[PDB]
Structures are given as C-alpha cells and as structure tokens.
Amino acid sequence: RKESYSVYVYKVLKQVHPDTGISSKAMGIMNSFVNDIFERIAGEASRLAHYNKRSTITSREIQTAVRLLLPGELAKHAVSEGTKAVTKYTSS
Amino acid sequence: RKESYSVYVYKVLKQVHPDTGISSKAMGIMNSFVNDIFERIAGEASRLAHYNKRSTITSREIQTAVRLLLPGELAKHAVSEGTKAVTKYTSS
Amino acid sequence: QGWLKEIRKLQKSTHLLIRKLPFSRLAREICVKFTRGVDFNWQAQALLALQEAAEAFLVHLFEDAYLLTLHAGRVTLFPKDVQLARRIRGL
Amino acid sequence: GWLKEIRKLQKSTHLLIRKLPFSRLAREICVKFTRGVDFNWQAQALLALQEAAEAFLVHLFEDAYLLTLHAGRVTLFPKDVQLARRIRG
Amino acid sequence: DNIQGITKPAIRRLARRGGVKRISGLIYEETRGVLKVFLENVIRDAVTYTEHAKRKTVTAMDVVYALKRQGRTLYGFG
Amino acid sequence: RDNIQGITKPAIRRLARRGGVKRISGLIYEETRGVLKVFLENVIRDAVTYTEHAKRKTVTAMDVVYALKRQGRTLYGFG
Amino acid sequence: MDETVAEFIKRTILKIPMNELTTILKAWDFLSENQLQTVNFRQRKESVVQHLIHLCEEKRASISDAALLDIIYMQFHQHQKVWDVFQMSKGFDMKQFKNSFKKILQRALKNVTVSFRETEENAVWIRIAWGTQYTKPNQYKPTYVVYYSQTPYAFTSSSMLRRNTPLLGQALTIASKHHQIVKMDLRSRYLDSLKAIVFKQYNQT
Amino acid sequence: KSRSSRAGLQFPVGRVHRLLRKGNYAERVGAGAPVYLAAVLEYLTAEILELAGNAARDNKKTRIIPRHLQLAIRNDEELNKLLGRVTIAQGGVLPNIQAV
Amino acid sequence: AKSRSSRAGLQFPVGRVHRLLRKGNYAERVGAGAPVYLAAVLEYLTAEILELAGNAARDNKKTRIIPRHLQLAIRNDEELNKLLGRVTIAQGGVLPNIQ
DNA sequence: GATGTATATATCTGACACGTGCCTGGAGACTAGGGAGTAATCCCCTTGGCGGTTAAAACGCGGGGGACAGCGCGTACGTGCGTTTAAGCGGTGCTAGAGCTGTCTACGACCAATTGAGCGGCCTCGGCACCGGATTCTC
DNA sequence: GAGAATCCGGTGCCGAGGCCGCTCAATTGGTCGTAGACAGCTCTAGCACCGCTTAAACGCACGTACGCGCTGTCCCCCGCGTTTTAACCGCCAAGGGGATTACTCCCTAGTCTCCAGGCACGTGTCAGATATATACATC
C-alpha cells in the first residue's frame, strides 16, 4: 500500500549487469536517490512554468531543467537519450 | 499594469518614521526583499501540505513555517504579532 | 608509527565511530529542553539517522579544517583552525 | 601609506572595474556558450553581472586574507586563493 | 554528565578518519561544543514537524526532512 | 587583442583594497583573471539558458537575477 | 562537421513560416525528396526543424549552403529591410567579376564570407559576412548587394555594422571595371520603387 | 470594510491571497492564513526600516540609500543569519581593518 | 492491454511519474510527452551510477552491492561529484585520502 | 608644522514626493461538496528493567617530535614620476527586437469499466562475515 | 632477516531473490473547453561609431619591509601497560499511542456583480554633490 522504486532499479541492474545482486539496504539509497532527482527537475521545471507566465509542463521545459540541473557531459548524454525516447514514443 | 510593493513600504515607513524619505533605488531593494520572503514561507509551508498528506494552507502551517524560517527572537515576535492580527480579524 | 596503520584501517571500514546509548541520551537531553513538560518518543531508526549525519558532518569538518595546518607549515590541529574553518563557510 | 587608501575605498560605493572592459569580456565569454550567436544585453543586466562579480571577489579576497594572517604572512600569495575555494566548495 | 559520552578516543577516531596526523589537546572541548551547536539546529527543526502532525513520536522522515531543509541532504533512511 | 586584460593591474588592486589586503603578491594578477572567468561561465551559461527558453534574443536583468538565485548567491537590487 | 552551422540553419528555418517552408526547401535544392516525404509537416515547428537538422546531420553541410539558404530566405522578405542605392561610373562576364571581388575582399581583411546566387535579368545576390582579423565572421548581421551586369547600379542593404561601407564601395569599384562610386538620396523599403526610379531614367536616357 | 483595514494591517490581503491562489502551492487556500502572512511581512519590513532609518539619521542625511541598508543588515545579528547569502546592489562593505 | 513503458522502450514507469506530477501540484496542466522524457532521464542517471558501481563491486571481488561501493562510485567520478555534492550517503565512509 | 581633516556655503542639478485620471482587480453574496475534525479501537512499536561479558575507556610515564622565537640575506613589492593609451560623454542614427493583440486547433482534463502489474507475505541457499592458516617486508 | 601485513580456506547464518494471492490503480475510450502556437504590426532602447579629452594606466628606477630557511630550546602528545567500567545482548512485561474507519458538517471555490483602490503620467522644488575655502589633529 506504500509504493517504492525497488523493482525498477532491480530490472535496470539485471539489464546492464548479468548477476550482480544488490542488498536490501543499498536499494533503499536508490529510493532516496530517485525520489530526490524527480523532486528537483520536476520541481524546478515548474518554476519555468511561472516565469514565462504559462500553465503547462511540456517536454521542452523538462529539457531545459535537465540542461540546468546537470553538469556538462552527463547533461549532453541525458538530453541526447531523452529525445531518442520521445521520438519512438510519438510514432506509437 | 506591472504591480509592485512600493506604496505599502512607503506607508509603513511614514508610519514608523515622521519624514524619513526613501530613494527610488533602495525601494527597489525592498521589492526584491518582500517578493523573496513570501517566496520562502508561502513556498515552504506548501511543503508541509505535502508531508502530512493534506491539501490546504491554513494559519497553522504558516505559523510553523515562520517558526522554521526565522531565527529565535525575531520568530518569537513574529508569531506573537501574527495571532494578534488574526484574533482581531476573526471578530470582524 | 601506528597512526599510519590506523588511518588505513579506519578509512576502510564503514562502522559507527560513536557508541549508541551516550549519543541517544544526549539527543534526548537536547530534545527535553525544547517544548518542556512532555516527553518525546523516538523511533529506533531516527536516532541512527541523526547519528550518521553527525558523524559525516564531523568527519568532513576535521578533514576540511586539517588543510589549514599543512598551509601554516604545522602538522597539528588547533581550535584556531576549527574556528577559522567555520568562519570561512558561514555556518 | 596604504592606510589612507583603504579607508577611502571602504566608504564609497561606486563600481571599480570599468564598464566597457567588463562588457567586452561578457560579450566574449557569452558567444562561446551559445554556438556562435550574438545577443543583446539590456543596459541593466550588465550592472547585475558586475555587482555580483564585485561582491564575489571582495568576499573571496576577505577570506583569502583571513587565511594569510594565519600563516604569519601579510603578503597574499596564489597558494592562498586556490585554497579558499576548496574549503568553501 | 550526559556530554562526556563523546570520549577522547571517539573524537580521536573521528579525526583519524579525516586524515589528521597529530592532534592537539584543546580540540576535545571545542568539538564537543560544535557538536552541541550542530545537534540543536537539527532537533528543533525536526520537532516542529512533530508538533505539526499532532503525534508524540519523532519519525525518521522528520529528521530527514529537517536535514533536507538544513542543507545536508541525507539518503538511504527514507 | 588581449581580451581579459581589460581587467587591469590596478583594478585587482582596488578590489583587494576594498577587501582589506595590505600587500598583494605577484602572480595574483595571473590567478584572479582565471577565477573570475570561471565564475562568469557559471552565470552566463546558466543565464543564456533561460533566455533561450522564452524565445528571446535579449538577455534581460531578470534572467541574470534568476541564474544568480539558482547558483545560491541571491541578488536583490535589480529587477 | 562543426557544431555552429546547425544552430544557424535551425534559427533560419525557425524564422520561416509554415505557409511556404516546403517552397523554400524545394527551391533550396539540397535534400532528397524522399526525405521531404519522410518529414511530418503537421506537427509543431519545434520538432520539424529538429528532424530536418537530423537529416542534415548525416549527409552534407557547410557554411556556404547555409549562406545560400539565408540568401533565399532574404529574397522573399524584402518588406523587412530598408535598401540603399549606389551607382558606379568612369568606365562583360560575371565569373571574372566573382573571382575579382572575392580575391580583393579576402586580400582587404582576413576573415570575410562571400556568397553568390544567380537570378534572372542578369541579377546577382551577394551576401557578405564581415569580420575582423581576429574574430569569426558574424553570420547574423549580413550585408546584401543586388548587382546587375548591364546597369552600373547596385542595391545595398543596411546593417548594424558600419565602417566597412567605403571599404566595400572601393573594393566593389575596383572589383568592377570602374573608378567612381556615388551615394544617392534613395533609401526606401520596397525594391520596386527604386527599380522604377532607376530604370525609367536609364532605359530612357 | 476592506480586509486590510478590517484586521488593522498595512500590507494588502487580497493581493497576497491572489498570489497564493495562482502560485501553485496547494489546491485549497484557507482564510486565516494570508492575514497572518501579511502581518509577518509587515513586521519584517518595519524591523528592517527602523534600523535603516536610524543609520540614515546618524549619517546626517534625510534620505535612505542602499549603503544604509547594508550597514543595518550587517550590524544586526538576527538579519545576519536571515540574510546571510545576500548580495546588495550599490552595497559596499563594512569598514573592516585588521592588523597582524 | 498495452504498457506505457513498452511503447517508451524504457524500464522506469510512466504512469506513476505522471500520477506524481499531477498530485504533487507542480502545475495545473501536465503535458503528455513530459513524464516519458523525465523517466528516460532518470533511467539514464540510475544506469550510469549503477554501471559505475558494479565495476568497483567486481574490483573488491564481490557481487552484492553495499553502500561503500556507491560511495566510491560517486566520489571517484568527477561529474557525479559535481552533482551529488551536498549528500552524505548513509553507512558510507570516506575515500582513501592521505596528506 | 605642513598635511591632512572636518565644516560653511554656492549653487546647481535633477530625483522625488505629490496630485490627477483612470482601468480593473478586490469586495459582497451564496450555493455545494469534498476535507477534515472528532470518536472509537486495537495492535504494534517503544520503553523500562535484570543480568552477565567483554571490549573499551581512563590514567601514569617518558620520550622523541614538533612548535616557537630570533635572525640574516635578499629579493620581490610600493612608491614617484613622465608618457601614452584607452575609457567616458554625448550625440546620431537607426533599426532589430520585445510584446501584444486575435485565432483556431490540437490537446489534455474528466469520466465509466476492467484487468494485470505490482505490493504483501514466505522460504529457502548461496553470498558473505568471521575465524584460523600459509606466504611477504621493511630497520 | 623476523613480528607484522596480505591472501586463503572452512563454516555458520541470514538476508536476497524466487514464488503465490490478490486489489486497486493504471489503461482504454469517448467528450469538451481552452492554452497556447502562430502571424503581423508597433514603439523603443541597444548597438555602432566618432570626436574629444583627459584620467588613469604603463613603464621604469629605486629603496627597503617582509619571506624564508636555519637553528636552538623547551614542552608536550602518543604508545604502552594496568585497572576499571559501562555498552551491549538477550529477554520479558506492558502500555501509550499510531494507524484505521465513520460520520456529519462546514468552509472554502465558482460564478456573477458592483466600484473603490493602485498604477501611469506629469511637475515644481528641496536634498545633496561637488567644489572651494577655511578652522583643528597630528608623527
């Protein structure tokens, strides 16, 4: 009844690694990681819905929030991967 | 068409001081002061509408936000003055 | 020597360098002085959380304040070093 | 000697870095982070850049000089400035 | 007492983790002092949340939120 | 052609006198010209983004105020 | 390729309205029509140009092709700018003229950018991007010259960047087979009025 | 009959309530909150301007300039911790001199 | 009858992020394409930090991730140290740093 | 004792406190429906205590290691002063660019049925933590 | 040139991952109001430049005030061995209150309607700025 993000982190770990197990405590760290970055970006992009006097959150505002909240090379890889996800989402 | 807080700061200054003038630049500082504290308190109390799984902002949440966002004696004077304003607001 | 082994040992393991019950009694003593009369229940995980934060803060403070003793040519810390290290940040 | 110079400069409030070299420096650095596109700074925003830069440098040299009196120096070496940034983070 | 539980070898191990080679003697007071002036600013910033949701129990999320507002974000214990 | 030497040899001296330093050393003149430059990048790259988002070729004062607020060094006096 | 011309092509196509963007891209003659068929022309403009750049990421790009796109963009927005009228005197293939003008201008300053385009009534549209001997040429503030082989007249676009006006005038006078250049009062917005006020006098001298 | 004068305040109440509706802070906004908020803002504004006016008076000038707010903030202890990460335009610094 | 992450080609969920981004009161209107992009960004960040953690896990001849491995994989990399600066990982310890 | 160091006033200069017109956002009214405050409950998580051990802290001691104070050489820095260069005023032009006013359309809230993806409880078994053993290293 | 540091092996143990039941929240689908992309027009305020002019930087010569390495002295933390002590483990009782559900009710939100307040504009006029000139404070 109280959800978390353990199953999805476990699926990503079994994707990019064959059999590397993860303890039940360190997984908790991953929860408080990715209940945190989502608090920043999807918080901070909300601020860019207020300075430009808008009311929506489209993909462009999240793109600029990722351009702000991350250092250089990691931000470049993230913005290169996200639109790659969106383009194969559009032609469903 | 673009509002500000100059008139009210001028009224408070003429209240607590007889004839002390204020320049048109320093008044601008007061704008960016009190478009800022209102961004903190009425921002941060919104967070206390989310941790307790509520949807309202009553006087009690603003009271706790003032208890958090201010150092000791200034917070004590502010919480002593605010309820004094509210009690003479209720019996209208 | 001796210290050269202890720095290698303590930087390897990830234990708790402060004992449990004195830190818990200190936290309860501080919590009593605010909003008196009533006691305050503590969950057993919250005191561990505050202990991990306090240990990480003090280790980071000593590691940051040590760099103002190699800078003066000395080897040894002083309370001047710690007070200056807090003066630089603004805490 | 210098003591009549400090107590004159901690009294006034005007800008110290001249406006046109700082404007040329900002227009130089800005064109590298926008893929070769010019911009048009409002005449108000360059004052904001210059005030933030002056406040940051004055606070930085105050903390660096606080470091210089610790080691017996009076002179402010470049070992002092590159250490008051790693402490502050 | 209730402050002398943070003994001399405790602060000594806290320093030896930090890379400090040789330690003076007066540190063992000031560190205790700064420890107190840390924990107070975590306690009341916690307990106000405890006084808001009207319960007599400080949860771990309250301390995590007090450290969130303080500046030092803590992971794991959420 | 020098492009960073608009910061002069005594302008750094005026900033050090405002800071309260009695006697500057030598290579500080080659050090501060680094540090300032780095700081301006972490404003201007952070301030060219906001004005890129609102389809404006004009970098207003509010954009630099927002970027400085996001860095942590809040600026009041303009707007 | 470099990572500067992509922003220029993106900004130029963002300035193009959707009413004739397919006309611009068919007249520009740089991509395959199958890749025109691939691109959705029904979603919003903030991703159509992303798809078009991603087409031009792979195959070919330059600064010259982007400049020629800029020329074709400027040829359909003559209502925006304000023009100036020159004339030479004291004195023919256009290939030698192109080579002479480009070599004289590249010997005058270090960094310039010249681009030509052939148009009927023997017209040539010359885009000039000025620069210095230390900086890149500013693409975003061009200078356009409408030159005719028959008439000694030339239409001149104004710009922010002055101080290269007598340099361009003397370099174009030496680049042509002439010795004198004038500067009349004729400064207006529409090209057809200047065309009429020149050609009613020139065809009927 | 206005809500500013009904509670005996000087800062507006309708504008603060308008900025709490359109500020995306909670889905519902009570009536007892923004009067409390405007009272706290009025107290902080008076707290700054009293010290600013006294420092302007002690410099024998009948006008408030940003150097006076700089002195009043950096000489007060509470506002030193409230505004500790604040730069002020046309600011200046404190008269700081120290020897060896 | 068809999953959102399966259209997205991702692994993090999409409907849960959209539910939180409506219920969090961040804006009064949520665009449809936003949480897919946001979930892809979160997936790339978690993939990067676990990809850096597993190499240090095999470096210590282990296959079970303890928090010390996450501490080292954060602090040794430069750009993640730029990102996760003011974060104290629980049960973490410090880098081997002498003199 | 001449060089600052504070003060009288000259006037002149422009910001600013103020007065008016005026557009629109704030107040009055009232229904309505979800938010929540109060009441009860039951378990579940915390508090208190008995007891025994065993690492862990406290305390003398001496010894080298280091901090501190003086000091001489010297060199890198402040200052004085003529030049020459670049910065400011200010004035003109003058046009790209903010913005803002309509429009129409794709698009996202809003809502009824429905079902499987994910959460709670459980059960190993291999990964791992610790304990004991065999192979290197500097004083 | 041998006690100390590193790698290795064996054994208990316990949490990590697989598995099932299930339920509620995410999906699918059809409806409608509207947020915002898009175009075009209009005022404005930022950039380029130029002539002047002049205030400040630049370059240099030089005197000398600190930087730094050295060295002597004296004190003062760290390692070591012994004694003492309280932290912890595991248990056992018990009970205070945290989480859950019900139920009414009340209080804020929406829409309409009316007008008083806060903003843009314009203007005389006092506050200070800077400048010169003259009475005190001092190494």
Residue numbers in the entry:
A (entry chain D), B (entry chain H): 33 to 124
C (entry chain E): 45 to 135
D (entry chain A): 46 to 134
E (entry chain F): 24 to 101
F (entry chain B): 23 to 101
G (entry chain K): 1 to 91, 99 to 212
H (entry chain G): 15 to 114
I (entry chain C): 14 to 112
The publication says:
A crucial role in this process is played by centromeres, specialized chromatin domains whose defining mark in almost all known eukaryotes is the enrichment of centromeric protein A (CENP-A, also known as CenH3), which replaces histone H3 in nucleosomes. The primary function of centromeres is to provide a platform for the assembly of macromolecular complexes known as kinetochores, whose task in turn is the physical capture of microtubules of the mitotic spindle. In vitro, these interact specifically and selectively with two CCAN components, CENP-C and CENP-N. Binding of these proteins to CENP-A nucleosomes has been shown to require two regions where the CENP-A sequence diverges significantly from that of histone H3, the L1 loop and the C-terminal tail. In conclusion, the structure of CENP-N contains an N-terminal Pyrin domain, a central CLN-HD, and a C-terminal CENP-L dimerization domain, while CENP-L contains an N-terminal CLN-HD, interrupted immediately before the C-terminal helix by an insertion that contains a region required for CENP-N dimerization.
Using cryo electron microscopy (cryo-EM), we obtained a three-dimensional reconstruction of CENP-N1-289 bound to CENP-ANCPs at ~4.0 Å. CENP-N, whose structure changes very little upon binding to the CENP-A nucleosome, is positioned on top of the L1 loop of CENP-A (also called RG loop for the presence of a conserved arginine-glycine motif at the loop’s apex) and contacts approximately 15 base pairs of the adjacent DNA gyre. Of the ~2400 Å2 of CENP-ANCP and CENP-N surface area that become buried in the complex,~1400 Å2 are at the CENP-N:DNA interface, where both CENP-N domains form extensive interactions with DNA from bp −21 to −35 relative to the twofold axis, or superhelical location [SHL] −2 to −3. Four loops in the CLN-HD straddle the DNA double helix over ~8 bp, and the consecutive 7 bp are bound by the PYRIN domain, which is positioned to insert an arginine (R44) into the compressed minor groove in an arrangement that is reminiscent of the minor groove arginines inserted by the histones. CENP-N binds the L1 loop through a continuous interface comprising the α1 helix in CENP-NPD and the β3-β4 loop in CENP-NCLN-HD. The interaction with the CENP-A L1 loop engages a triad of residues, E3CENP-N, E7CENP-N, and R11CENP-N, whose side chains emerge from the same face of the α1 helix looking toward the L1 loop. The CENP-A residues R80CENP-A and G81CENP-A form a two-residue insertion that is the most conspicuous difference between the L1 loops in CENP-A and H3. The insertion is crucial, because it allows R80CENP-A to form hydrogen bonds with both E3CENP-N and E7CENP-N, while absence of a side chain at G81CENP-A allows the CENP-A loop to insert deeply into a cleft formed between the two CENP-N domains, where the side chain of Y147CENP-N packs tightly against V82CENP-A. In EMSAs, mutation of R80 and G81 to alanine partly ablated the preference of CENP-N for CENP-ANCPs.
